[PDB]
Amino acid sequence: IVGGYTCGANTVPYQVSLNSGYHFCGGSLINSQWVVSAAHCYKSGIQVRLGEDNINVVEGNEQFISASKSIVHPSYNSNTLNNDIMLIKLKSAASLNSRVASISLPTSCASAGTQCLISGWGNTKSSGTSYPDVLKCLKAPILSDSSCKSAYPGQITSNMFCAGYLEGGKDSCQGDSGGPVVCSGKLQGIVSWGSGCAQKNKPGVYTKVCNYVSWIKQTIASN
Template sequence: MNRLLLSVVALVALVSCAQGHPDIDFPFGRIVNGEAVEIESHPYQVSIQTTKGSHFCGGSLISSDTVLTAAHCMQSYAASELQVRLGSTSRSSGGEVVTVRAFKYHEGYNSKLMVNDVAIMKLSTPVRQTSKIRAIELADSEAVSGTNAVVSGWGTTCFLFCSSPDNLLEVGVELLHYKDCAQDTYNYGSDSILETMVCATGEKKDACQGDSGGPLVANGKQVGVVSWGNGCAWTGYPGVYADVASLKKWIDETSASL
């Protein structure tokens, strides 16, 4: 399931799972179990919104006029319906709001397999980079399992029945190479975790709904884009991200041509 929408199917599955497995941990806390942070800590973080100001996904500034986000975030919109808020800890006020000129998502995106879950957005006007608005460098080498990373966003603070915070949150996690994530240690299996993905895990720590498209960062570079997961912070189900390094050629070429 992607991190953008909750569905009736998910709710039914959760209730059924809880009845059959009373030992399941239900996550409560922040992003999940993260902490509040100021935008200066993640100046590349942006809120992707409708032009009415409704936040629905995260993204990252990768140049003065280019935002990286998830393909699944872009499925229901035209560019004219979108805006981006940059440089603000709050998703609802402050910073700069810039409209979107165009966007393109990966031609190989598959909503069933969740492969190639990346999209590029072009802003109507370039932004001036400051301490609160700054592009992030993209990783160009594969993730190393066990590397410390951080994911940020304005998503919900638990899987179900939680509102989205107005102020930015972050949570620390550890990277998992896709081959490690696909091992029997975790519950996805090798058919679900594919080469254009990277995972991140933490004890009851994860991204959640509304964080989709946002940045996973390690060693000062963006290594992932929030993509999908089974629940949020459920034991045995790491968060799954689009792998920036394996998709970097497409990102660079699309950013240059769009």
């Protein structure tokens, strides 16, 4: 996250870190046994780390649970990043508490102008590299479809939306991928892509989660 703020320990209780020896992507806990992340975050050998603040210190609220199965969306396209979403099942159910909690799935899509909370352990510089140890947060609005398509001609599908600031300075970034965009208490987006980070006229592009709720529910029901 570029141009955000330190969230506070365990204030984003659905935020997960995907670990393969090191943090490499975010995710969102959606029930005791399932995490939603970005398909471009796929790899084998994932350990899900719940209850994190400092990803480099054991602080006492963590739960570390191996993935038993990963499911990339059937129509994910890694060239266009259309359908950039994946489900991870945990080998065991998380113990849910005030600091490890699921985030509600949307029943309706969000609209341009709605404020949202975006979070992660990604890069904090736009012309630089600096990775934080504690979780960073950004409040950002959803942008109109037309301004999104105008910023990124020929690239925005119906499964994407833009959020952030066209002036630049405030965005998600490398290492935030897969993590949450939560608006009025609902998981509306997944950190997906963008040209650089926090560049003028290049807002963040996010997977439109409301399009996938039927897929998520039926997948969970059969797995």
